[PDB]
Every structure is written in C-alpha cells, then in structure tokens.
Design an enzyme around this catalytic site. Structure first.
Site, PDB file in Angstrom:
ATOM      1  N   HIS A   1       0.827  -1.180   0.020  1.00 37.88           N
ATOM      2  CA  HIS A   1       0.041   0.191  -0.100  1.00 37.88           C
ATOM      3  C   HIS A   1       0.611   1.140   0.057  1.00 37.88           C
ATOM      4  CE1 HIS A   1      -0.133   0.410   4.388  1.00 37.88           C
ATOM      5  NE2 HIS A   1      -0.278   1.565   4.115  1.00 37.88           N
TER       6      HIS A   1
ATOM      7  N   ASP B   1      -0.159  -7.619   1.812  1.00 38.74           N
ATOM      8  CA  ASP B   1       0.288  -6.153   1.761  1.00 38.74           C
ATOM      9  C   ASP B   1       2.002  -6.177   2.015  1.00 38.74           C
ATOM     10  OD1 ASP B   1       0.505  -3.514   1.631  1.00 38.74           O
ATOM     11  OD2 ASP B   1      -0.542  -3.122   3.728  1.00 38.74           O
TER      12      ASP B   1
ATOM     13  N   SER C   1       3.701   2.830   8.222  1.00 39.45           N
ATOM     14  CA  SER C   1       3.626   1.675   7.285  1.00 39.45           C
ATOM     15  C   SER C   1       4.711   1.361   6.489  1.00 39.45           C
ATOM     16  CB  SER C   1       2.413   2.151   6.401  1.00 39.45           C
ATOM     17  OG  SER C   1       1.189   2.343   7.128  1.00 39.45           O
ATOM     18  N   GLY C   2       4.942   0.064   6.239  1.00 38.03           N
ATOM     19  CA  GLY C   2       5.911  -0.506   5.530  1.00 38.03           C
ATOM     20  C   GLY C   2       7.134  -0.706   6.308  1.00 38.03           C
TER      21      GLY C   2
ATOM     22  N   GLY D   1       2.360   6.834   8.786  1.00 40.27           N
ATOM     23  CA  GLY D   1       3.538   7.175   8.549  1.00 40.27           C
ATOM     24  C   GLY D   1       4.529   6.034   8.548  1.00 40.27           C
TER      25      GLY D   1
END
Ligand code: CA
Length: 223
Positions: free
Chosen positions: A40, A84, A177-178, A175
């Site tokens: 995402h 994801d 994420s990942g 922020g």
C-alpha cells in the site's frame, strides 16, 4: 509510533525511509540492493534513504539511493490489504556498515507472545497529529490469532497477525506503514493497518513475512 521511545541514532540499522520529496513510509533493508515494504506504500519515484535518524537533518551516516524497480506482491488486494508486501530494488548497492545493515528473513513463523521491535517515523499521537523527526521504537508482543480475529471480525487473513496491547496506548500509526517488526533478529512483520492508532481493543495489524520468504528469495534471484 504512539507510546514508544526514541530509538537512538542508527540503532535500527535496517530501517529505511521511503522518500518522494518527503518521508511517506518505512521499509526494511534485506540485502545491499533490496528493501521490503508494504504494497500500500507503492508509488513511482521512490528514493530510499538509509542510515537515517533525523529525517529532516543531514547527520552524516545517510545513503540516498533511488529505486530502479518496485514489485508489488502478485496477489495484493488493496481493498482488504491481503498480501500487503512489496519489494524495492535500489539502482546501486548500499554500502553496508554498522549503521546501514540488512535484517535476516525468518526461517519459521513467530509465535504469539514473542516480543518484537516495531519502528518508524509515523504519528506519535492517537488523537491528533505530531510527526517526529527522529526514529521511534516500540517493544510489543505478537497477539494470538484468536484475539486478533476477535478484535477485527471478518478482516484478518492468514497473511496477517496482530501485535501490541489491547488496553491501548502503544501502537504503530500513520507514516509507520511499510516498516519493520523484528523478533529475535528476524523480520517477521511489516506495518500494515489498524483502526485508528493505539485504540483499545484495536491492535496493530502486520503483514506475516514468513509466508513470503519463498517469493522474496525467488524474486530477488531473478531481478
Ligand atoms: Ca538525516
């Protein structure tokens, strides 16, 4: 990260910032040429920033390397966030050192109750907004699949796990994420989603990296 602590500069040497003129997501360095992040977080024009602490100040240990290619998982579903995960290849290899280092992939899945380290430059407030300049960290346990499913009816797939604190107050956030979830020196999760941040009964949901090791290795070997 809400309810965490200041990691300390370059104490999380596999943490990357993905930058498109600004920080927008985290990632994890898995070898000199490849980063793992959340699907995402995909966009074109990514510069990977390694060796960061304060993302707004050049402090002396950074390496800025543009991405040459990104590969979203073949089965990523942006509606459900199933699968994801994405891989990002660097245009040139990073120079690995004590402050810029890969993190190992898992060789088996982690268990509920294992303590992990979650990190990022995301929002530090659960109501409201404040974005840190320096990297934040949170130690949190993996939660049971049954508690995870109960927290998020109809939403948790076999490619997700929950980690955090049902009482609230401590979580990843927008922020982050990942970015990484590291347990016993292995990358077990990727910051993926949750309802709000740090809310009671709404723990963080993370991509279950152990399910993807074969895809990661095969993809790197041919790209
Ligand atoms: Ca910096």
């Amino acid at each position: 990260i809400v309810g965490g602590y200041t990691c300390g500069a370059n104490t999380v040497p596999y943490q990357v910032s993905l930058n498109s003129g600004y920080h927008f997501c985290g990632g994890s360095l898995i070898n000199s040429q490849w980063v793992v992040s959340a699907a995402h977080c995909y966009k074109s024009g990514i510069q990977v920033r390694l060796g960061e602490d304060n993302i707004n100040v050049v402090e002396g240990n950074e390496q800025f390397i543009s991405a040459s290619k990104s590969i979203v998982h073949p089965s990523y579903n942006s509606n459900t966030l199933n699968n994801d995960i994405m891989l990002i290849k660097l245009k040139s290899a990073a120079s690995l050192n004590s402050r810029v280092a890969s993190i190992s992939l898992p060789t088996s899945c982690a268990s509920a109750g294992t303590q992990c380290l979650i990190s990022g430059w995301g929002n530090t407030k659960s109501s409201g907004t404040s974005y840190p300049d320096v990297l934040k960290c949170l130690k949190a346990p993996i939660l049971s699949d049954s508690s995870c499913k109960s927290a998020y009816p109809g939403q948790i797939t076999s490619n997700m796990f929950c980690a955090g604190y049902l009482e609230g107050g401590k979580d990843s956030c927008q922020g982050d994420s990942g970015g990484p979830v590291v347990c016993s020196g292995k990358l077990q999760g990727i910051v993926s989603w949750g309802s709000g941040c740090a809310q009671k009964n709404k723990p963080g949901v993370y991509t279950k990296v152990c399910n993807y090791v074969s895809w990661i290795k095969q993809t790197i070997a041919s790209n």
